[PDB]
Design a protein around this ligand. Structure first.
Ligand SMILES: O=C(/C=C/c1ccc(Cl)cc1)NO
Ligand SMILES: [Zn+2]
Length: 407
């Protein structure tokens, strides 16, 4: 009915087939607090990844309420307020993770994310390794006690503007965590319950003209996951680098020909910048003499980050950045993991450049297997929807797309 396991016995990435009503257990279903908020029920879908089926009234203090206050936006303060909606959200996100993970490209990306633990750069003491507190959540147990847990990624519902999907994180007072190689826990505001439109002209009747298509939400989620990859490895491009408007970071993440507008000399400058930031992490690890807030050894934690950053270790135990391994990791994160490449793997229709979307917004439901599948998305095989991206055509597959207003 949901079609969460098209092949084999169990889901390959997501650890459990959760229902929103499943009781808290303190392990993979728990009330959590993000470090004034009321605890929120959350689900651990994989090592280092949690899903919070709530509207994001938490991560930004100046975004506390859901009422309407630039090209396309959509508001509904009631969306994701009921347990049934939260259940369907959780199943939708689950399904999209499995769809992404069904591709070679998605397995690579999600693996990189899970391995991309934010750096222990939180000490004021130059020789001490320490966690940064905003890279953790507090996980409340059924008896009310709690423990701090490090994590890499949180998927949460949108804030006021429902179609404003983004990858955000908590800043540091002095450190630029998304741009100094350290990385930080990433919060993706995302809904699987809506999508947006784009126009495309397909060739053949001659009288066809342009069709009105819907973006596949697996592509949208993969896009935000790619930002998360850049930001977890602390190699995001400064958002003040823009064409005008579209940021270099957006063009890089969209990939394809869009990314070719970032000139090679600029690319080289960034790569060298981040190579140097990774060498600074290697020397920080080499200079480390003590560790706080864990029963894990210093040796053990040093190794966790050797593993993240693909560092070389000599017989003396000294770390260093290997230029070939750096280039491999950097190219993977920036050139290989792109929206364009996911489109190619999914074999779906997508807009051909970052800015070429419609102001059109649609309500969708991808949870039913009759609507959307892990292998085909909307373009269900052995039906009329398999040809000419008819599943994504909002006039042909009208039952799957309800057109919204238009704020
Ligand atoms: O780039 C984005 C979001 C892009 C986007 C959202 C909504 C619509 Cl309608 C178009 C593009 N997040 O990282
Ligand atoms: Zn983006």
């Amino acid at each position: 009915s949901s079609g969460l396991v098209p092949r084999g016995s169990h889901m390959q990435f997501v650890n459990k087939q959760f229902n929103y009503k499943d009781p808290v257990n303190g392990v993979d279903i728990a009330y959590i607090k993000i470090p004034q908020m009321q605890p929120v029920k959350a689900f651990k879908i994989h090592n280092k990844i949690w899903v919070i089926p709530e509207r994001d009234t938490f991560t930004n203090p100046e975004e506390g309420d859901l009422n309407p206050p630039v090209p396309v936006s959509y508001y509904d303060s009631t969306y994701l307020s009921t347990d049934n909606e939260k259940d369907n959200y959780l199943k939708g996100v689950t399904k999209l993770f499995e769809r992404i993970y069904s591709t070679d490209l998605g397995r690579m990306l999600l693996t990189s994310i899970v391995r991309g633990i934010p750096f222990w750069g939180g000490s004021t003491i130059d020789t001490e390794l320490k966690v940064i507190d905003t890279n953790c959540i507090n996980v409340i147990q059924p008896d009310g006690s709690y423990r701090s847990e490090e994590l890499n990624l949180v998927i949460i519902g949108p804030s006021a503007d429902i179609i404003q999907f983004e990858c955000k994180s908590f800043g540091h007072e002095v450190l630029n965590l998304t741009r100094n190689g350290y990385g930080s826990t990433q919060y993706i505001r995302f809904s699987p319950d809506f999508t947006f439109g784009f126009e495309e002209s397909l060739e053949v009747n001659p009288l066809l003209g342009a069709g009105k298509f819907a973006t596949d939400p697996a592509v949208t989620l993969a896009h935000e996951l790619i930002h998360a990859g850049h930001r977890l490895y602390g190699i995001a491009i400064n958002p003040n680098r823009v064409f005008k408007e579209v940021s270099f970071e957006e063009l890089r993440t969209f990939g394809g020909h869009d990314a070719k507008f970032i000139d090679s000399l600029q690319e080289n400058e960034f790569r060298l910048y981040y190579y140097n930031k990774f060498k600074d992490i290697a020397s920080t690890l080499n200079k480390a003499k003590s560790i706080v807030g864990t029963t894990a050894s210093l040796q053990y934690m040093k190794n966790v980050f050797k593993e993240k950053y693909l560092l070389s270790e000599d017989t003396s135990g000294k770390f260093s950045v290997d230029k070939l391994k750096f280039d491999k990791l950097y190219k993977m994160l920036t050139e290989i993991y792109t929206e364009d490449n996911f489109v190619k793997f999914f074999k779906v229709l997508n807009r051909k450049t970052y800015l070429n979307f419609d102001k059109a917004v649609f309500k969708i439901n991808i949870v039913p297997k009759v609507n959307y599948t892990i292998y085909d998305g909307f373009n269900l095989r052995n039906t009329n929807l398999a040809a000419n991206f008819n599943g994504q055509n909002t006039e042909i597959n009208n039952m799957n797309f309800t057109k919204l207003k238009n704020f």
